[PDB]
Amino acid sequence: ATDTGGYAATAGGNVTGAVSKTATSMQDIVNIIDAARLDANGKKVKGGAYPLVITYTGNEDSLINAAAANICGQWSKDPRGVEIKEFTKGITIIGANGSSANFGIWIKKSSDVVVQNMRIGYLPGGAKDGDMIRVDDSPNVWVDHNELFAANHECDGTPDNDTTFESAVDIKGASNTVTVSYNYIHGVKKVGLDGSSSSDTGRNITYHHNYYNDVNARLPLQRGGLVHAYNNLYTNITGSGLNVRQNGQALIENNWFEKAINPVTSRYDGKNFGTWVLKGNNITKPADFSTYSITWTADTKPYVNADSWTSTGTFPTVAYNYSPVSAQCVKDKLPGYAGVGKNLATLTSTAC
Ligand SMILES: [Ca+2]
Known part of the structure; x- marks a missing residue:
């Protein structure tokens, strides 16, 4: 089936007529996609020649570990990323258990793309768009069960004092429907945009069952459109959480916030504040702030x-099927379903 538990509805490359390939390294993935574009006669087929499932078995722990040992030397390096440009036959990039990457995945003008079981960390090229996962002009994308990490730190002397590391899952353009789920995102300062600018508004994104720890902001930085965030575990948010801007609407349901600064907000624009519908979160009222170490700050x-902690607007009826567990259950259970090596295990109220 194609149910992603969110706005995206796709099985990626796991469809009829798909071809399975194993990538042992970054270049192997690049080479596999290139070959997947040619027909039996070596001629290119628009959107790819057939659906593809690429199982990545490479491991770049030494690169990830060396980077972690000298985080400030990362931003000035060349960015590395497997581009998935104009591939619309259906594609999935799934990491094998134990695999790892010190490069990102850049989805662009593609559709029906799935990224799973990928452990991506401490990527080089913060000053040159060295993103872990980017979804640009691409609908029906599902970023699921990955581990996206770096250091939630900003070295000095970086361009715009904001480039030590790039994003975990930036979304922009006509990526009309995307589902970001079961990801273990940690040590990331700028988690993910949902629109690249004030003018890049819209899209319907679902963030569910993601485990965020030690992240500074953008969960997401939403610009217009709809954002449904349910069953996520937000802990140690050092700057801000969901930032609803350019009149976007968010449905914040059954999440667990704890040790978070500005968990739900609308800042940095000075106008066109977005709205939020709050329900079933661990925080039910302002009296719960102290309980969960929830803090607030002002802006210029x-x-x-x-x-x-009251809804500031409405949200249309959620189109897809989804069965959220309680906020207490995500707190208790989520850390073992989110991330890589959980065999793509999903948290159901049965396990609560
Ligand atoms: Ca980026």
């Missing part, structure tokens, strides 16, 4: 914090 420009 007009802003709206959920310091009242």
Whole structure:
């Protein structure tokens, strides 16, 4: 089936007529996709020649580990990323248990793409768009069960004092439907955009069952459109959490926030504040802030914090099927279903 538990509906490359290939390294993936574009006669087929499932078995722990040992030397290096440009036959990049990458995945003008079981860390090229996962002009994409990490730190002397490391899962353009789920994102300062600018508004994104720890902000930095965030575990948010801007609407349901600063907010623009519908989270009222170490701060420009913890607008009926567990259950159970090596295990109320 194609149910992603969110706005995206895709099985990626795991469809009829698909071809399975094993990639032992980054270049192997690049080579496999290149070959997947040619027909029996060596001629290119628009959108790819057939559906593809690429199982990545490479391991770049030495690169990830060396980078972690000298984080400030990363931003000035060349960015590395497997581009998935104009491949629309259906593609899946799934890492084998034990695999790892010190490069990212850049989805662009493609559709029906799935990324699973990929452990991506401490990527080089923060000053040159060295993103872990990027979804650009690509609908029906499912970023599921990955481990995206770096250091939630900003070295000095970096371009715009904001480039030590790039994003975990940036989304932009006509990536009309995307589902980001069961990802273990940690040590990331700038987690993910949902629109690249004030003018890149829209899209319907679902963030569910993601485990965020020690992340500074952008969970996501939402610009217009709809965002349904359910069953996520947000801990140690050092800057801000969901930032709803350019009149976007968010449905924040059954999440667990703890040791978070500005967990739900609308800042940095000074106008066109977005809205949120709160329900079933561990925080039910402002009295729960102290309980879960929830803190709020101000901004130089007009802003709206959920310091009242009340819905500030509405949200259309969620189109897809989804069965969220309780907030307490995500707190208790999520850390073992999210990330790589959980065999793509999903948390159901049965396990609560
Ligand atoms: Ca980026």
